[PDB]
Amino acid sequence: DQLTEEQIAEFKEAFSLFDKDGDGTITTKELGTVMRSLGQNPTEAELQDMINEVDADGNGTIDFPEFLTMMARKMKDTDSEEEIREAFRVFDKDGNGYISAAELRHVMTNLGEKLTDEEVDEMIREADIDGDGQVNYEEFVQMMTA
Amino acid sequence: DQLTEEQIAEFKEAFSLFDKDGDGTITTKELGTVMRSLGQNPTEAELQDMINEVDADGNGTIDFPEFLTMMARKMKDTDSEEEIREAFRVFDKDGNGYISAAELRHVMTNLGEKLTDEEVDEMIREADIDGDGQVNYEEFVQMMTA
Amino acid sequence: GRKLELTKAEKHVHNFMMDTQLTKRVKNAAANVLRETWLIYKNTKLVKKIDHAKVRKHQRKFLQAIHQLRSVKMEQRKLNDQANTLVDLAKTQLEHH
Amino acid sequence: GRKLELTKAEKHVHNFMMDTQLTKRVKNAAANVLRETWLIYKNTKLVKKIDHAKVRKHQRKFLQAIHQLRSVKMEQRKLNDQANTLVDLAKTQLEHH
Ligand SMILES: O=C1Nc2c(ccc(Cl)c2Cl)/C1=N\O
Ligand SMILES: O=C1Nc2c(ccc(Cl)c2Cl)/C1=N\O
Ligand SMILES: [Ca+2]
Ligand SMILES: [Ca+2]
Ligand SMILES: [Ca+2]
Ligand SMILES: [Ca+2]
Numbered sequence: 001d002q003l004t005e006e007q008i009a010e011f012k013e014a015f016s017l018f019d020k021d022g023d024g025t026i027t028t029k030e031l032g033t034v035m036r037s038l039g040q041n042p043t044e045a046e047l048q049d050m051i052n053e054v055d056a057d058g059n060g061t062i063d064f065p066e067f068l069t070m071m072a073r074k075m076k077d078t079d080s081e082e083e084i085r086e087a088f089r090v091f092d093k094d095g096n097g098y099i100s101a102a103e104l105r106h107v108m109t110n111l112g113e114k115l116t117d118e119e120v121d122e123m124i125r126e127a128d129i130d131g132d133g134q135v136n137y138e139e140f141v142q143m144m145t146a
Numbered sequence: 147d148q149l150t151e152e153q154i155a156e157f158k159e160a161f162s163l164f165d166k167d168g169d170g171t172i173t174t175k176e177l178g179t180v181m182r183s184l185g186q187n188p189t190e191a192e193l194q195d196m197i198n199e200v201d202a203d204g205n206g207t208i209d210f211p212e213f214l215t216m217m218a219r220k221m222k223d224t225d226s227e228e229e230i231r232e233a234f235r236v237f238d239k240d241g242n243g244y245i246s247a248a249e250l251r252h253v254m255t256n257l258g259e260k261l262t263d264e265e266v267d268e269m270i271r272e273a274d275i276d277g278d279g280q281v282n283y284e285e286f287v288q289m290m291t292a
Numbered sequence: 293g294r295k296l297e298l299t300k301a302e303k304h305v306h307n308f309m310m311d312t313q314l315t316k317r318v319k320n321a322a323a324n325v326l327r328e329t330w331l332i333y334k335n336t337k338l339v340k341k342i343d344h345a346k347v348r349k350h351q352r353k354f355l356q357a358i359h360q361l362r363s364v365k366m367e368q369r370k371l372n373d374q375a376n377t378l379v380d381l382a383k384t385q386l387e388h389h
Numbered sequence: 390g391r392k393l394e395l396t397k398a399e400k401h402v403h404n405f406m407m408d409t410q411l412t413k414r415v416k417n418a419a420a421n422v423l424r425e426t427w428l429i430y431k432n433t434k435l436v437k438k439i440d441h442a443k444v445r446k447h448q449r450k451f452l453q454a455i456h457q458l459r460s461v462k463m464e465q466r467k468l469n470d471q472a473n474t475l476v477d478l479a480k481t482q483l484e485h486h
Contacts, residue, residue, distance in 0.1 A: 007386055014382035035374065038381065038453040039418070040460055042374055049311045049371055050378070067382075074379045078300040083455055087422035090415060112420030113450070115427070123427045126435075144430040145296055153483055160479035181471065184356040184478065185321070186363055188471055195408045195468055196475070213479075220476045224397040229358055233325035236318060258323030259353070261330070269330045272338075290333040291393055293444065295433055296426060298452060329393060336392055347390065348484045355395060355477040362470050366463065373459050380452040387445045 001072045008068075015067055026051075026062040081145040088137035101133045147218045154214075161213055172197075172208040227291040234283035247279045293387050299376045305368040314364055321360035328354035390484050396473045402465040411461055418457035425451035 018026045018034055028047040035042050042050070054066045062070075091099050091107050099107075101124045108115045108123065115123065126143075127135040164172045164180055174193040181188050188196070200212045208216075237245050237253050245253075247270045254261045254269065261269065272289075273281040309315045331350040336342060406412045428447040433439060 010385045010388065011382060014385040017381060017385075018378070031378075034381070035377070038377060039457045040374065040377065045311075045313075046371060046374060049308055049314075050375055052311065053308055053375070070375070071379060071382065074299050074376065076300045077294060077297040077383075080296045080298055080455065083458070084296065084422060084426050087419040087426075087454075087458060090419040091423075107420055108424065112417045112424055112454075114420075115424055119427075122431065122435075126430075141426070144426060144434075156482045156485065157479060160482040163478060163482075164475070177475075180478070181474070184474060185360045186471065186474065191408075191410075192468060192471060195405055195411075196472055198408065199405055199472070216472070217476060217479065220396050220473065222397045223391060223394040223480075226358065226393045226395055229361070230325060230329050230393065233322040233329075233357075233361060236322040237326075253323055254327065258320045258327055258357075260323075261327055265330075268334065268338075272333075287329070290329060290337075293433065293441075294448070296429055296451065298455060332393055336390065344390075344484050344486055348481045351391070351481045351484060352478065354393065355474065355481070358395060359470065359474045359477070363467075366467050366470065370460075370463050373456065373463065377452065377456045380456070381449065384445045384448045384452070387441050387448060389441055 003072050015064060079145055081141055085138055085141045088141060097136060097138060098134045099137055101128050104135055149218050161210060225291055227287055231284055231287045234287060243282060243284060244280045245283055247274050247281060250281055299379045301376060302372055305365055305372060308368055308371045317364050321357045324357035328357055396476045398473060399469055402462055402469060405465055405468045414461050418454045421454035425454055
């Protein structure tokens with residue numbers, strides 16, 4: 001729960017992602033905007049709870065050193081292999097551990113933000129290890145998270 | 147996922163807990179009232195989702211046979227020992243597995259719906275197995291869930 | 293760099309308390325779990341004569357208290373992931389240069 | 390009788406789908422997990438030349454997709470417990486007579 005100097009300047013940059021108006025403080029309103037821009041929908045009470053848990057001076061907003069106590073308590077990361085595998089499993093229609101190259105291309109060119117057919121070409125080249133037109137997504141995800 | 151006849155008449159009684167106006171149908175509005183009476187706060191969308199998952203005829207309300215498909219898929223129960231233990235642990239101030247008889251009486255006569263001091267007398271008589279004025283709540287909960 | 297890793301979640305969710313509302317919700321619901329567990333036990337095991345209207349009443353109050361505690365725990369998990377989302381976003385600035 | 394038992398929860402939460410909104414949320418977010426996992430992998434492992442502005446961009450989109458899927462899963466768990474609350478309440482009428 002200690003923080004090198006190196007990641008202070010970078011977290012200063014991080015602060016400006018949250019401090020939208022640049023007034024030097026993050027409010028529930030700014031947090032709401034940021035959270036929604038990330039596809040989430042926290043309630044007013046949830047935003048207030050987030051501000052409050054690291055609200056040292058109790059002034060209802062988050063400053064920089066409060067912003068750092070939130071990090072220090074959470075610098076620890078963990079691999080995402082399992083969660084990524086579960087995202088691929090959404091498209092595994094027959095629950096057999098495979099998604100065909102054709103179905104992967106169909107997913108990637110139609111759903112979410114999407115990839116170009118040329119980007120999909122590269123993804124499938126890597127994903128279809130056996131060259132059988134089928135993607136064993138467990139193995140593919142393990143390769144990418146190695 | 148099969149249902150004896152015996153628990154049809156009893157589930158008919160159950161239906162009237164939900165069908166507040168008695169018009170023979172349960173609406174999102176009635177579900178909202180019931181859920182709040184149980185100390186929960188489902189959103190409009192959550193109420194609609196509950197109605198919808200067992201909404202066979204798609205008319206936006208739940209009838210009796212739809213009310214039974216919800217049960218049949220969930221007649222299976224499970225013991226609550228662990229959850230009950232965790233509720234006692236809320237009052238274990240020092241995290242040592244014990245709550246004193248004095249602190250238990252204080253909790254039960256002041257928090258939630260409460261017990262009379264005479265009801266607490268009986269609870270502690272049972273809970274303080276060793277007669278040491280201390281309640282090993284893990285053991286007490288195991289006794290009650292046996 | 294961090295590549296595909298994300299902020300590690302707290303294993304158990306005993307936090308965001310002193311949100312007085314959630315904390316007050318916990319103490320009252322937990323007291324009620326104790327209350328109704330005791331009253332159900334008494335009325336099904338320590339009487340000569342089981343009064344089923346009584347058992348039903350306390351079963352209703354027991355399930356409501358248990359489910360209130362579940363509700364708080366789920367909300368804690370949700371708040372924790374919301375916070376972890378913010379930490380994850382801030383950690384993207386660690387990817388340099 | 391049922392005493393202190395309650396409706397057993399579904400182990401994993403693959404339900405309440407065809408709530409089109411949640412289901413649509415899943416397909417789009419999951420597609421985006423695949424998209425950003427691929428783009429991060431490519432830009433950190435299949436280039437001669439790591440463009441960190443690119444990695445940061447895709448890390449932001451990756452975390453948002455992962456956390457959107459978490460959000461859906463948490464909401465499914467919440468809906469399931471809400472339904473289980475109703476089933477538990479109805480099961481009190483099984484306590485007779
Ligand atoms: O509880 C928290 N609230 C937070 C956190 C981290 C960053 C920000 Cl901006 C906020 Cl509002 C928190 N901890 O990770
Ligand atoms: O998804 C469900 N919605 C339900 C259920 C059971 C009872 C009732 Cl009233 C409703 Cl609205 C459900 N299953 O347990
Ligand atoms: Ca600001
Ligand atoms: Ca503050
Ligand atoms: Ca009605
Ligand atoms: Ca219907």
